[PDB]
Design a protein around this nucleic acid. Sequence first.
DNA 1: CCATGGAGTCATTTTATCTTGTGTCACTTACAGAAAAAGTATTACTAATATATGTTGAAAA
DNA 2: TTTTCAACATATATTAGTAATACTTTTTCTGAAGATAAAATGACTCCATGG
Lengths: 149, 50
Amino acid sequence: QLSDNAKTLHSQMMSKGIGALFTQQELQKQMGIGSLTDLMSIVQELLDKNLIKLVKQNDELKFQGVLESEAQKKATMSAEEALVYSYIEASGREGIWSKTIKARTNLHQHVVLKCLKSLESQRYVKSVKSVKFPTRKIYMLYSLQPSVD
Amino acid sequence: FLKVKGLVKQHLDSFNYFVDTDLKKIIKANQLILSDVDPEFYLKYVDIRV
DNA sequence: CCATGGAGTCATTTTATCTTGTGTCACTTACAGAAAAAGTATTACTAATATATGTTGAAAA
DNA sequence: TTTTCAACATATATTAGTAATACTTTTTCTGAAGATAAAATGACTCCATGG
């Protein structure tokens, strides 16, 4: 059920969520009882309904629990920022840099600027000028700044 | 034979077949240009005439 | 002490390479973006002027 | 109905003063055949031990 499996599949996330290492294989590890296209229909919608997330690492694709703070955050973010923003926080520590976001998003530097500045007013990302040469202004989450110097 | 089809068709007829046919085909190859921004825009070539 | 094994040097090919190619007229036609600096366009005011401009509409035929 | 008016209005430009903001610029500032050779080929020989 959309709301039931929404809240109980959010319950395995809010309890543990198999940490960050959680992949879709761990779904069948806990609840595999659901049919494939159904549990995936509600996975797809809860990611659309921003009650779950997906992280890109290693084998398969990771999932995690997400609350309305960052959920209404990203749904409030534009369609431009949509994949952009959540892709930025993937670094979370070392940040990421201008042109290396351009190729990954397949946009210009024309547009990726204005959504960045939008995120600057948003203050969910902060300008960071790191050890390597100050041509960069790498961008990590406005909240977190673990870094090498 | 030579009265109907002139002595030089070679430069004539190929140039005619150009200005009539290929010009219509060249834009028929690229009739759409949209740069990447403002997903609602497009410029569609349709006709060529001289 | 001597035949052996192993290597070290030393001719020897076969591949990778570069300089040429008759003479004479006579016309011809450094990437891009980033930041700092400089400067400015509104952004209100009268306040006179006199076109443009739009609309509209009212007024007349 | 249509046309002329009118009329209403509103920019348009000057000169100011601010003051503040926003906004573009500019100016740094860096992230064709026959020699020549090179190497693989191979034979020679110094020099090793051992029956």
